[PDB]
RNA sequence: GGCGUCUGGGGGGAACGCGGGGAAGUGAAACAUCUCAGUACCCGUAGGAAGAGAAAACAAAAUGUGAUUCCGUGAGUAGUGG
RNA sequence: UUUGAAGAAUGAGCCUGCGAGUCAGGGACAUGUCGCGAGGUUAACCCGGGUGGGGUAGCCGCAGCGAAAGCGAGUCUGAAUAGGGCGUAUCCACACAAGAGUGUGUGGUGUAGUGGUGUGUUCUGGACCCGAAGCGGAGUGAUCUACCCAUGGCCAGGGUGAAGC
RNA sequence: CAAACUCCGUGAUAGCUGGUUCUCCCCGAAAUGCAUUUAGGUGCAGCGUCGCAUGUUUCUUGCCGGAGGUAGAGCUACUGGAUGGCCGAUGGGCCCCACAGGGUUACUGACGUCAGCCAAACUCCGAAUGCCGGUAAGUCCAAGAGUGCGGCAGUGAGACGGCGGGGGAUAAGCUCCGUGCGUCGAGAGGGAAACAGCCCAGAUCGCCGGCUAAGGCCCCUAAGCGUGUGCUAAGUGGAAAAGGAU
RNA sequence: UUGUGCGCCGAUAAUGUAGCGGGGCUCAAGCACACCGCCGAAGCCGCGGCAGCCAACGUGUUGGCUGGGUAGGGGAGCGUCC
RNA sequence: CGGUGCUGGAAGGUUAAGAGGACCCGUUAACUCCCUUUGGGGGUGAAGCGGAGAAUUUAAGCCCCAGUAAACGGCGGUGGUAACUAUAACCAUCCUAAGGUAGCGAAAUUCCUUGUCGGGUAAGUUCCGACCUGCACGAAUGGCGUAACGACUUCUCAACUGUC
RNA sequence: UACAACUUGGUAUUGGUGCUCGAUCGUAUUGGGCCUCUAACCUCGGACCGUAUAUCCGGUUCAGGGACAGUGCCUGGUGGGUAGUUUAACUGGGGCGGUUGCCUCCUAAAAUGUAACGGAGGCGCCCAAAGGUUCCCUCAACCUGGACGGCAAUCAGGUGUUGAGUGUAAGUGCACAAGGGAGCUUGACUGCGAGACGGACAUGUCGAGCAGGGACGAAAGUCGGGACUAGUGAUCCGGCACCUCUGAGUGGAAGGGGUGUCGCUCAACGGAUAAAAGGUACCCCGGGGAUAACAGGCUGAUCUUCCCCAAGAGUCCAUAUCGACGGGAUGGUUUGGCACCUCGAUGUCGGCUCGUCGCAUCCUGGGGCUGGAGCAGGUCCCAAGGGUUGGGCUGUUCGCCCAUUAAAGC
RNA sequence: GUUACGGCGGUCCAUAGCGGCAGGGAAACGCCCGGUCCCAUCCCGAACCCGGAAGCUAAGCCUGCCAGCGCCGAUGAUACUACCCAUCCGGGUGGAAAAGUAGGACACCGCCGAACAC
């Protein structure tokens, strides 16, 4: 008797990485989703691998529109 | 070898600038492409070698 | 730990070392002016007495500093920076 | 070849020096190249020292060094090395 | 030593003496601390039956960048003000931008390393202490045993009865 | 004697085993990941320490903004899986095959619909928790809180118990994981007789003082052979089930 | 019939009761429910002592805290020979 | 006689050192455009020098052809196939070189296994004698018998006895 | 991986003639092959001498060989004869199996991460377009059939919301398309890169903007490879191309140098070497209960022994005696799992002697019921006082056999 | 201001969808008439595009009504769980689902542009 199973993969460590209401800076990554679990919003970039980030300082803001999930950044007021 | 190894050269330059792989079985005709190589500073077709 | 050590899993830095070197030293134009309250010419022996280079050392320097006092120069290989510094100071920096 | 006669040498000695020969344990985390090292050890010489010693050497335009030997540097640098 | 031992796991019969992180190197670094300070310091060596004096030969930092040519408070990259990498010790006040977090220009505060001495670590040395099976070189052995070589000695008594005659 | 003996290289080499000597004061680990001719070794990062620097940036809670996709639940919602019913033309088909009447014959019956479960690789649903981000109060004669840099070594053999689990048979004091789990390790004290890991609780020192936690109060043994209300006849208490019994 | 709390049988090991720790316990010293108590540690408090860190003031006192500890790190010492 | 060896045959293919000099490469006199006046700045390449550098000659051997087993070594499985009964004693399959002949055979080899049967005993997993379904005998790493021999192995019998 | 030995040729100890064979049938190519000869060389043939004695040796003569042989040096073969070595780890003891990197999901406890020889599947590519962009458009399910033609081929009418699909597995996504078709064409650009994600580390991922040029679209804009997640390899050594790098003293050149780029199922996939198999019962050393073999221990799958419901067997009758399909327990004895104690030592099966205990009792003792006429049984309950064969066979425990007893207990 | 009009838009995008029923052509909307010229059918003026308004609102769209189906959704309870417990054995406080149930429900709203009125 011998087993043919027992192999696996690495652990990419996906998942949202900057949470709602946080303060992020330009070029900052937001999520790492295999599929399009989310959707870009104003000031959000669609990465080469379905990754989400920010193209301008501000506070990230989730929100559901038309029954999907889309990320967006509200520029925090300049002090 | 399933996927040979091909280099590409400019004409005025003649510098092994671009290298790419192909299926020689299905492409017996040589590869032609229009591209850029930096030093002569402008686009120019690259040949195969 | 047997694993490929760092000092052995990185590629050698290219290019040679050109053992043949006629190398020199720069004594700042600012330091020279600070040393010359009255100024005047500058010679190898004088800068040795000033202790800013090896006494036998042959010198190539730069014009990082400004020259306001008339200071003629007795030098071998200048820098254009200190050359213009001397010229604006209204002296000479001749290259021997 | 055979005699006979004068003069030498014959062996011992702790190290050093020269010269002929010359390995493995070990490190390389194994191991052959490699290292250990021309080390231990063996052998033949002389001496109080020996050995080396008067460039067929270096250097680099200076119209420079000037036999050999031993120190401190230069420097763990240029380099050599599965 | 162990996750763990009153341990029925190991070591110790007892006593007394002996017994184990030392030592060298312009070796390297950091911390103390000592002298001088854009300087710090000398080796070998010479001469004082005495540690003095001389000796700057040399090494480290004062400037870094670049593999190198070379450049130089910049430099490399690059076709490039066009920012980035590495330094410009480090900061204060004034102006220009976006306020992509900070960058870009002025006037001052102006750069701190080096050689001892002791200390931890690393370094090559046997390097905290004892310990092996074993490999190699030089020599000593066949007075036991193995074999063989030459010369001597040993095998009481009693039966069986080939060839030959 | 599976390569004689003495000397020498020889302090051969030993990731292996043993041992490592005077006192006190301060802080205080891990048995993890990754990699490894690596698994009983070693190095890197976490974990400690000392110093320097930023001096609260850290911590706890409250409130706010958040994304989940677990427990659970559900399925005429899908992928699967399942029982029982309904017309069932048409088994998408049969006693004579007429090109036309009936399982005139008990079958099959598809679809769908009525309802009832199940799933780690099902989710038309979906929490308490945990985490990250912002604000505010508090310990703020300092934890001796954090982060960076610098000198220093340990450790990378874990155990047990509670939680959620894989494997095992829901067996092991079993093995393998997660616990900003706990404890032992590296922890003395009291309780469970004895018993590290279970319960209570952190040993600066001394006192022939007092109050208490867990656990106990008839005697061994300190504490009520207490108060009131009920149950038990079995020494049940002071080892156990399916089932059985005026 | 039903829901119930207690009970009983169901119940066999090996050196010696040995399945409350033991004696003993039902005229419970058992079980369930409440109360008041009291014992019970190196926990806390009480008194005296030492030491570390910290803040204030001073030219070492006051006050707040902490002080178990292996590998290991840091600090300060005792003693022996010369 | 396939493999490995050894023995003969070297006609062919491959290959040593050693010789070697085609190509390619370096250098340099002359030059080659224009500049001065008394060769270099915008490429050729002189002879030699040298660098890598040729092809060409090469023996044994290996590849190749035979022999050789008292050289090392092997000697099969598959199916069909009778006058009652189970057989193969005959034919077809593959493949290798062949596929175990005489002799013996649950033995020093037989795992089931104490095979089955008979002898010896009341009883015999040991023994002896046979059968052959030889897991996994076998003919010079020898087969079969063999008189005698043996401090050899197994077994039985009479005497023998304190082994009991 | 070599080396001793054996074997070849060239080269030297190296001489000559005759012949026969070659590239500038009557002109030229210097070496190969053969036959000779003495003179190098050998002679372990002879005979003299050193010698008065000498089988060594040296010299002399002659005799045989003779350019061979032998010997060196280079080289090729063969080369366990000799020598230095290698022969992995993971492992629920080792060995044999299987795996060794990468990718998807679950286990994973709703941030990440999170092991196991746990459950399940794939990768070591493909692609000049399957890339970029512009534009058009969207299915499958569906009733009917001028005939083939059918359950399904192509269809249009007119419910039609992914149930069809999307290069290679699964998950995540995807109709605003990441799905097809076409047109065009190369951005599968060049140099940088604000900042981030992940990384112990080397690495690995994402990315707006800046300069040249180009691509699609009038433009808006998008374009730094494929919908994403696998399709991979460090360092050294070397090869190749370009440069405004150096250049061992003059130039230089050469010599070295950069940017670009190739050479590994180095898969044991962070790669000990360019170069690797086995026994040791002839063994040896340092270690471990970190890890097995016996025992002890924990556990109770299996075992054995109980028990529960009750169909049928038993002339009919469940329970005289058996009990189908099932279920619940006990003991720790068999086969087992774990590795907690012992590897600076816990001696192992049988036999002998000696025993000691429990009771699920073998006889002896007392009872209940019988499908108990009696005798003789069967079964269950109480009971551990006592007793409980000998031989043949094999090492046997066991077991069969023979023959006894009340029995020949577990 | 009204409207039984058309575009663009919103919204933790179905209380907003689907189904049946009825009604609209003044303008606008659809269908519509024909393909010389633009342009297209991997054929077709089906799609698109273009010229014109003869006709009609059947289809589609819109609006109004219907609870047939989707759909939202209480309070309450139950499941669940953070922390703590008592010698297992489940309770104490905190948090509080899913499904089902009463019910709700045949979208609302913004800016412009068209026909009646000022
Ligand atoms: Mg995964
Ligand atoms: Mg390129
Ligand atoms: Mg002498
Ligand atoms: Mg080594
Ligand atoms: Mg090693
Ligand atoms: Mg060596
Ligand atoms: Mg050497
Ligand atoms: Mg003399
Ligand atoms: Mg001399
Ligand atoms: Mg030197
Ligand atoms: Mg321990
Ligand atoms: Mg202990
Ligand atoms: Mg004892
Ligand atoms: Mg012990
Ligand atoms: Mg012991
Ligand atoms: Mg031990
Ligand atoms: Mg002892
Ligand atoms: Mg003694
Ligand atoms: Mg040092
Ligand atoms: Mg210092
Ligand atoms: Mg100083
Ligand atoms: Mg002096
Ligand atoms: Mg440099
Ligand atoms: Mg560049
Ligand atoms: Mg710049
Ligand atoms: Mg000192
Ligand atoms: Mg030796
Ligand atoms: Mg002798
Ligand atoms: Mg006769
Ligand atoms: Mg001896
Ligand atoms: Mg010695
Ligand atoms: Mg040595
Ligand atoms: Mg030693
Ligand atoms: Mg060592
Ligand atoms: Mg030990
Ligand atoms: Mg502490
Ligand atoms: Mg603060
Ligand atoms: Mg929430
Ligand atoms: Mg949510
Ligand atoms: Mg569930
Ligand atoms: Mg349900
Ligand atoms: Mg479905
Ligand atoms: Mg139901
Ligand atoms: Mg689920
Ligand atoms: Mg999902
Ligand atoms: Mg979680
Ligand atoms: Mg927050
Ligand atoms: Mg404090
Ligand atoms: Mg530090
Ligand atoms: Mg350390
Ligand atoms: Mg380890
Ligand atoms: Mg471990
Ligand atoms: Mg472990
Ligand atoms: Mg663990
Ligand atoms: Mg355990
Ligand atoms: Mg735990
Ligand atoms: Mg558990
Ligand atoms: Mg374990
Ligand atoms: Mg503690
Ligand atoms: Mg304790
Ligand atoms: Mg106690
Ligand atoms: Mg205390
Ligand atoms: Mg007592
Ligand atoms: Mg009392
Ligand atoms: Mg009381
Ligand atoms: Mg009372
Ligand atoms: Mg009462
Ligand atoms: Mg009891
Ligand atoms: Mg009971
Ligand atoms: Mg009952
Ligand atoms: Mg009742
Ligand atoms: Mg009873
Ligand atoms: Mg009691
Ligand atoms: Mg009290
Ligand atoms: Mg007390
Ligand atoms: Mg206290
Ligand atoms: Mg105080
Ligand atoms: Mg302490
Ligand atoms: Mg420990
Ligand atoms: Mg310590
Ligand atoms: Mg004293
Ligand atoms: Mg033949
Ligand atoms: Mg042959
Ligand atoms: Mg063969
Ligand atoms: Mg030629
Ligand atoms: Mg051959
Ligand atoms: Mg052959
Ligand atoms: Mg036999
Ligand atoms: Mg026989
Ligand atoms: Mg036999
Ligand atoms: Mg047998
Ligand atoms: Mg038999
Ligand atoms: Mg017998
Ligand atoms: Mg047989
Ligand atoms: Mg055989
Ligand atoms: Mg034969
Ligand atoms: Mg034979
Ligand atoms: Mg043989
Ligand atoms: Mg024989
Ligand atoms: Mg015979
Ligand atoms: Mg007898
Ligand atoms: Mg007798
Ligand atoms: Mg030759
Ligand atoms: Mg010759
Ligand atoms: Mg060989
Ligand atoms: Mg060998
Ligand atoms: Mg060796
Ligand atoms: Mg292993
Ligand atoms: Mg195991
Ligand atoms: Mg095994
Ligand atoms: Mg997760
Ligand atoms: Mg782990
Ligand atoms: Mg596979
Ligand atoms: Mg395309
Ligand atoms: Mg149609
Ligand atoms: Mg596409
Ligand atoms: Mg498509
Ligand atoms: Mg950056
Ligand atoms: Mg541009
Ligand atoms: Mg771009
Ligand atoms: Mg791409
Ligand atoms: Mg792409
Ligand atoms: Mg290499
Ligand atoms: Mg020169
Ligand atoms: Mg030159
Ligand atoms: Mg070059
Ligand atoms: Mg690997
Ligand atoms: Mg490796
Ligand atoms: Mg290598
Ligand atoms: Mg051991
Ligand atoms: Mg052991
Ligand atoms: Mg141990
Ligand atoms: Mg242990
Ligand atoms: Mg045993
Ligand atoms: Mg055992
Ligand atoms: Mg034991
Ligand atoms: Mg058990
Ligand atoms: Mg009956
Ligand atoms: Mg019954
Ligand atoms: Mg163990
Ligand atoms: Mg133990
Ligand atoms: Mg032991
Ligand atoms: Mg022993
Ligand atoms: Mg024993
Ligand atoms: Mg035994
Ligand atoms: Mg009984
Ligand atoms: Mg009876
Ligand atoms: Mg009976
Ligand atoms: Mg009995
Ligand atoms: Mg009795
Ligand atoms: Mg009209
Ligand atoms: Mg038309
Ligand atoms: Mg209509
Ligand atoms: Mg319509
Ligand atoms: Mg709904
Ligand atoms: Mg609706
Ligand atoms: Mg509510
Ligand atoms: Mg609690
Ligand atoms: Mg309980
Ligand atoms: Mg609800
Ligand atoms: Zn070009």
Q: Please give residues of chain C from 37 to 76 whose alpha-adjacent beta carbon (CB) lies under 7 Å from any atom of strand E.
A: 51, 54-56, 62-64
Q: Any idea what the Cα angle at residue C78 is, between residues C77 and C82, rounded to 5°? A: 175
Report how far residue C41's alpha carbon sits from residue C94's, in angstroms, rounded to the nearest whole number: 10
State this model's resolution in angstroms.
Answer: 2.5
Give all strands (DSSP E) within chain C, no chain letters: 73-75, 93-95
* Residues with Cβ within 8 Å of residue C44, at least 6 apart in sequence: C59, C74
Give all strands (DSSP E) within B1-49, no chain letters: 5-9, 16-21, 33-36, 43-48
Instruction: Report whether C36 contacts C71 (CB < 8 A).
Output: yes
| Cα separation values, C18 from C21, C57, C59, C87, Å | 7, 20, 20, 35
Instruction: Report whether A34 contacts A2 (CB < 8 A).
Output: no
Judging by beta carbons within 10 Å of its beta carbon (0-12, 13-18, 19+), is residue C3 exposed, middle or buried? exposed
Q: How far is the CA of C44 from the centre of ligand 22 (A)?
A: 31
Which method was used?
cryo-EM
Q: Which nucleotides of D are covered by protein (CB under 7 A)?
A: 29, 78-79
Residue that has been written with the tokens 């803001």 in this structure: A61
């Amino acid at each position: 008797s011998s087993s043919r199973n027992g192999r696996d993969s690495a652990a990419q460590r996906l998942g949202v990485k900057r949470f709602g209401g946080q303060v992020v800076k330009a070029g900052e990554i937001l999520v790492r989703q295999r599929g399009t679990h989310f959707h870009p919003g104003v000031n959000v970039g669609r990465g080469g691998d379905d990754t989400l980030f920010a193209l301008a300082p501000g506070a990230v803001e989730f929100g559901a529109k038309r029954g999907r999930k889309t990320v967006n950044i509200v520029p925090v007021a300049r002090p | 070898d399933v996927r040979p190894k091909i280099t590409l050269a400019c004409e005025v330059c003649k510098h092994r600038n671009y290298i790419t792989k192909k299926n020689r079985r299905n492409d017996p005709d040589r590869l032609e492409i229009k591209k850029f190589c930096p030093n002569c500073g402008t686009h120019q077709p690259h040949k195969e070698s | 730990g047997g694993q490929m050590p760092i000092h052995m899993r990185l590629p050698k830095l290219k290019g040679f070392k050109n053992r043949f070197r006629t190398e020199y030293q720069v004594v700042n134009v600012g330091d020279i002016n600070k040393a010359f309250p009255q100024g005047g010419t500058v010679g190898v022996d004088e800068l040795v007495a000033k202790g800013l280079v090896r006494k036998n050392s042959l010198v190539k320097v730069l014009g990082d500093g400004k020259l306001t006092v008339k200071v003629d120069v007795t030098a071998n290989k200048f820098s254009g920076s200190a050359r213009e510094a001397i010229t604006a100071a209204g002296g000479s920096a001749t290259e021997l």
